Amino acid sequence: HMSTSRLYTLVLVLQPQRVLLGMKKRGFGAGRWNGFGGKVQEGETIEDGAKRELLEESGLSVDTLHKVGHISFEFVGSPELMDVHIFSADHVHGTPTESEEMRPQWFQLDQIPFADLWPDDSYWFPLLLQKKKFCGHFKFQDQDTILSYSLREVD
Amino acid sequence: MSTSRLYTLVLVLQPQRVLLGMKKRGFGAGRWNGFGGKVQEGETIEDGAKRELLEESGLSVDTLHKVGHISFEFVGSPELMDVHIFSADHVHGTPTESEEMRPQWFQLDQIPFADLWPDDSYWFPLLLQKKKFCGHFKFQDQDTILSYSLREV
Ligand SMILES: Nc1nc(NC2CC2)cc(-c2cccc(Cl)c2Cl)n1
Ligand SMILES: Nc1nc(NC2CC2)cc(-c2cccc(Cl)c2Cl)n1
């Protein structure tokens, strides 16, 4: 009997010359920059989950999200398949605001600090920045080392 | 670091039947499947899919519809198999047995799932309902799935 896939959301506010990231202040991935998101709850849609996490973590509200990717992840030593649903936003309401969990900061699109993002980001950001959609899977040894991956555009 | 190896799979899916091939040798011998194989350097995925369909079944098509993307791994290897799945409806020629595949039509309510790869039981319903999908399956061995993700795109 099977180990369950667990669902997560990730939102990247991607405007014409900049992307909003947040420095994670505690918990899983603390000390790296990332988009906003977290676990999708039982009883909520993925997109409602994404909007909720963007609001709680950054203080931003959105009318529209655009779904851009689906990437699953696994780590050696864990039975859990992490199933991450990735969205973009452009127009937003509110001002980026520091939360308990995240400190938002804008980055120019040619000045993304990839050394301080999850390692996978370096592989799929190019598709994200080109407004493409994609599916993939990454197998990690640990927080720093990818063992293998699959990634391709969907169209 | 491994990158995944690319494969194609083509299901000739008509209103009340689907064409499968019994694999005669190699990896998956003795199971029914669609037609396909390794995508080669220097050909597109879709051209690879047409190529394998022709080589294995003698059928040629004009149009393939992209249906799904599924990655696969087996416990105890970093190798990832990356399968791009396509449908076809109209085909030219006569399904003929090759060295690799024995083609047969199945009515859609009579697909022999026990003799397909185990994952097919999970994604065939999406295929049948014309839904596009992405997924990943981790296999303990050729009969046993440990873990999977599968979602409409
Ligand atoms: N960019 C990126 N890459 C990731 N790579 C996976 C090896 C961890 C995971 C995540 C992510 C997304 C949503 C929620 C959570 Cl907790 C995380 Cl960690 N983000
Ligand atoms: N239906 C299905 N399911 C699969 N499940 C993976 C555990 C093996 C693999 C395949 C497949 C597709 C193209 C080429 C080859 Cl060699 C194979 Cl084996 N097909």
Side-chain angles (χ1 to χ4, degrees):
Chain A
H1 208 56
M2 305 196 179
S3 188
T4 331
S5 185
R6 188 93 164 187
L7 279 182
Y8 297 84
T9 54
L10 185 62
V11 184
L12 287 153
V13 186
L14 174 55
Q15 301 190 336
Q17 324 279 86
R18 60 188 190 168
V19 65
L20 189 64
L21 298 173
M23 168 54 60
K24 185 142 187 194
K25 291 166 65 179
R26 69 187 177 189
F28 184 74
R32 279 168 165 162
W33 296 95
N34 203 356
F36 304 99
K39 290 168 189 191
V40 179
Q41 293 176 345
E42 292 186 303
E44 95 183 322
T45 62
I46 297 176
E47 191 182 316
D48 280 347
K51 293 170 164 185
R52 172 183 53 76
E53 284 287 19
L54 180 61
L55 180 60
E56 296 170 345
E57 296 182 351
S58 83
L60 301 171
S61 308
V62 288
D63 303 323
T64 317
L65 291 182
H66 182 236
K67 172 77 108 79
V68 294
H70 181 189
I71 306 183
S72 52
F73 295 97
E74 65 183 311
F75 286 83
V76 163
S78 303
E80 169 181 336
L81 191 53
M82 283 183 88
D83 206 68
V84 181
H85 294 258
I86 305 181
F87 294 86
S88 68
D90 177 7
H91 298 288
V92 296
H93 308 290
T95 296
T97 303
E98 178 165 359
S99 62
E100 207 68 23
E101 269 263 75
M102 294 290 265
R103 184 180 77 259
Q105 186 167 314
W106 292 105
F107 295 84
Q108 299 185 35
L109 300 180
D110 60 347
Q111 297 170 349
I112 297 167
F114 285 107
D116 302 310
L117 270 68
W118 282 99
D120 50 286
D121 295 28
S122 294
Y123 297 88
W124 59 260
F125 262 58
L127 297 181
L128 170 82
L129 294 188
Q130 298 161 43
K131 312 299 178 69
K132 300 173 178 290
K133 293 194 190 224
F134 53 87
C135 285
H137 173 83
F138 289 74
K139 187 190 294 197
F140 279 76
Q141 168 169 92
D142 49 43
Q143 70 172 5
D144 300 315
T145 303
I146 294 159
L147 292 174
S148 61
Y149 80 98
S150 152
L151 184 71
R152 190 149 300 234
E153 178 171 0
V154 295
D155 182 41
Chain B
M1 181 181 320
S2 313
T3 37
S4 59
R5 193 65 148 72
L6 287 172
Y7 297 78
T8 57
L9 189 64
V10 180
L11 286 299
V12 184
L13 180 55
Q14 308 189 325
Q16 297 159 30
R17 61 182 191 176
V18 62
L19 185 70
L20 300 173
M22 166 60 63
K23 196 155 183 193
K24 295 158 67 174
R25 68 193 184 184
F27 185 69
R31 291 191 210 245
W32 295 99
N33 200 357
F35 304 94
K38 274 169 186 191
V39 180
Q40 286 165 187
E41 292 182 330
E43 73 179 345
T44 63
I45 298 185
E46 171 157 356
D47 282 334
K50 294 181 181 167
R51 184 184 45 82
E52 289 290 324
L53 177 65
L54 185 65
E55 291 177 4
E56 294 174 10
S57 83
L59 300 175
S60 59
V61 304
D62 302 317
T63 310
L64 291 178
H65 299 275
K66 181 52 161 294
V67 152
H69 176 233
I70 297 170
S71 60
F72 296 100
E73 75 197 337
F74 278 90
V75 177
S77 185
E79 304 153 308
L80 271 174
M81 159 170 15
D82 216 351
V83 185
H84 292 259
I85 308 177
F86 297 84
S87 181
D89 186 351
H90 306 133
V91 285
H92 302 137
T94 315
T96 296
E97 180 161 358
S98 53
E99 277 174 10
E100 262 252 306
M101 292 292 261
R102 192 175 88 237
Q104 194 164 342
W105 292 103
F106 288 85
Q107 297 294 113
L108 304 182
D109 57 0
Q110 285 158 20
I111 292 167
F113 283 106
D115 298 318
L116 274 67
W117 282 103
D119 49 283
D120 300 32
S121 289
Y122 296 83
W123 56 264
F124 255 63
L126 299 169
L127 170 85
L128 295 188
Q129 295 153 28
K130 317 305 194 172
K131 297 180 158 83
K132 294 179 189 263
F133 54 85
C134 285
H136 177 80
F137 290 71
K138 181 163 65 172
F139 274 75
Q140 175 177 282
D141 54 50
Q142 290 182 36
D143 301 316
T144 314
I145 296 170
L146 291 181
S147 169
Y148 79 103
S149 161
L150 182 61
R151 297 208 51 110
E152 187 179 1
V153 301

